[PDB]
Design a protein around this ligand. Sequence first.
Ligand SMILES: *[C@@H]1O[C@H](CO)[C@@H](O)[C@H](O)[C@H]1NC(C)=O
Ligand SMILES: *[C@@H]1O[C@H](CO)[C@@H](O)[C@H](O)[C@H]1NC(C)=O
Lengths: 41, 41
Amino acid sequence: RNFYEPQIITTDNTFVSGNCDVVIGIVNNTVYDPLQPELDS
Amino acid sequence: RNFYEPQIITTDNTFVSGNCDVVIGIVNNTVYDPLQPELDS
Ligand SMILES: *[C@@H]1O[C@H](CO)[C@@H](O)[C@H](O)[C@H]1NC(C)=O
Ligand SMILES: *[C@@H]1O[C@H](CO)[C@@H](O)[C@H](O)[C@H]1NC(C)=O
């Protein structure tokens, strides 16, 4: 909040609560998964 | 800070900010890599 330091959205620094219906003003964007699934081939 | 309880350095309990140049007094040590790369068949 108090300093400008942008970061890439990741599934680790954001938690998940419920489905997409109930909230108001929610926007549609993809969320990057952690490095380990990307490392897996 | 308030009690002595040493722990093994791990990539999960430490976050990463930038490269090695800008800080002062930084020392050279190896950080335990996560379990996913270690657990490879
Ligand atoms: C915010 O205000 C604008 C006013 O133009 C409105 O169109 C928009 O629906 C408002 N946002 C939400 C989430 O309702
Ligand atoms: C701490 O002080 C000592 C004094 O001997 C000095 O040599 C050292 O460079 C200082 N630490 C840093 C990070 O500058």
